[PDB]
Amino acid sequence: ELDLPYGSALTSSGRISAVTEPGELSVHYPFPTMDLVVLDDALKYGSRAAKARFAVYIGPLGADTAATAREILANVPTPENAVLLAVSPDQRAIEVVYGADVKGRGIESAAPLGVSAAAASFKEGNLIDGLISAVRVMSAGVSPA
């Protein structure tokens, strides 16, 4: 009873079957591919060496920023053992949230470091680049447990 914007159709299962016109894409990420790849292996190999999902958020936080960040953290598959990094380029605000299960592993000694590195890299206009730096430092900080 939703809109299904001109091509989507709900199947006999819950799956949606979307389409695309011959001359467009289906991602629309305003970043180059060769930086998406770098952010991806950062996010994967740093999560291997720390036993904790690392996430990244870029949308707006038009409220109490920490409230909204911990509202968002409930969307990671295992939020209790996860580390999220939120960024709002309009409000120019950085927010790092933890989980209850990931703590006592050297996290708060590393969150301000990551925030400072992300800010120092953002002050020139490098979004993906600062995200990479912050993920690197926080993943190198947290210990496996």
């Binding site: 159709a9 079957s17 979307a18 389409v19 016109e21 969307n75 598959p77």
Partner: protein
Amino acid sequence: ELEARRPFPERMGPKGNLIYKLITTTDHKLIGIMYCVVCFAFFLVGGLMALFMRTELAMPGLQFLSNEQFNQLFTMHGTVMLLFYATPIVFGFANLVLPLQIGAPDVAFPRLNALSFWLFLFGALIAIAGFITPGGAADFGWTAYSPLTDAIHSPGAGGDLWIMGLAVGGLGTILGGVNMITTVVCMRAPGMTMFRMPIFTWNILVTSILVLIAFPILTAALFGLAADRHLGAHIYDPANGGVLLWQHLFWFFGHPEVYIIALPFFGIVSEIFPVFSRKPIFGYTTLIYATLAIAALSVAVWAHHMYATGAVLLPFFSFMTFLIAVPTGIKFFNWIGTMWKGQLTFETPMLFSVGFLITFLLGGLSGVLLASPPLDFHVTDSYFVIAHFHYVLFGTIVFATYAGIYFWFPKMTGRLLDERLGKLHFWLTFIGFHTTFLVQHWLGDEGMPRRYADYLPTDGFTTLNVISTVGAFILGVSMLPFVWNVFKSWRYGEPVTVDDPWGYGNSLEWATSCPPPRHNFTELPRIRSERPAFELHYPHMVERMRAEAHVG
């Protein structure tokens, strides 16, 4: 509600993910990929042989080759290009997209599939491994005429390997055909009757019937030839009717072969046209009947290859080839009608299909010109014939195969091939091809027969050979963009996170996830026509599809 994703899908895959799955596999998708890759390797080998031939044929005089080496070159070129690249690519496309199109989880016999693939590969490797013999590979023609392939003439050890490799490959092809017929007949979705399945599937069924009719007789002829070579079996002596017997048997095999490698690509292009024309396929049942007619007629024209022997009944075969010329015409007109008054967009598959149309029309015109005996009395065994069958072969296999690759790459990978590289590739191929093979009509009309390694400067036709070799080198350079595009776009390249990346699709394969799961389906739609995915993605269109389906 937000929903977690990845910045970019994974590029390659874990270590040890493929090599053992490659040996024990039984799913048709991996086997189709293997088919395609090895067939393109063999295509590259054959093309290299052709480039050697061209660079010798320019500049009168034997610069770096010999007569023996030239004969081996054109023999192996013809053999590889016809039997180790086209006949298996047919089954490659079949194994790729037939079970998806009929809505089945697998092929009928899943281990016979792998058996067929491995038989093909090892037979090809056996037949090619005659070049490491000090005497060389087979040196007779591709056709292996009657007393020249005896034991007295052609005594080397390359002809034996030739014969045995062909036998093994033929066994593999017969098994593949059996599997395809059984799959199309038995395993089918619970809603679709046989007059709702796509045209590609019908062409594959008919081609499999032709394979079953044609290949066993070739195996019989080859066993007779091997008996004659290794036991002195007096089967093909000219003292008996041994010279014309071989020709009758071989051509009864060999014309159904060209129609076998022609029909499924007609299917491919007929399946690509409506997606980019935004229209239904014009004359469904008409196309089915034309396919059946071509199939029935293809076995009773075998002797239009033996006009110059003076030993056949000319009016019969001449008239019946004139007859087989018609259904191809109705097929062509149905394609043009499907493109008529639509909304055309020229992405790479549509571009390659239009190129196919043009090239095949010219080739078929030259062929129907060739079909009259008093004209074949002059142009046979010349370069006119070479230009003709190169037009038809190229325009069909090469162009329709590139179209099929650019069309079904996402449905098998989840990525998208680049389009600028695709356009560059198409234009290079088109220009080089039409510049390498056009002057050969004139080159062969004036006396220059096929299979000559040298000629004299006092003769004419020394500039036309230079133009042809320039074109051949352009065609050779035209393959770098394609392999670069495939090498880059398989790992990187814009991912596909939806069904049907070419909107307005049909055929029930664009109704499942872009890389299909194992067993190909998580749910099926209700089937009412031959465009089920189109009616699934645009439910507000069935009233208009049923209302105005008969204006014309």
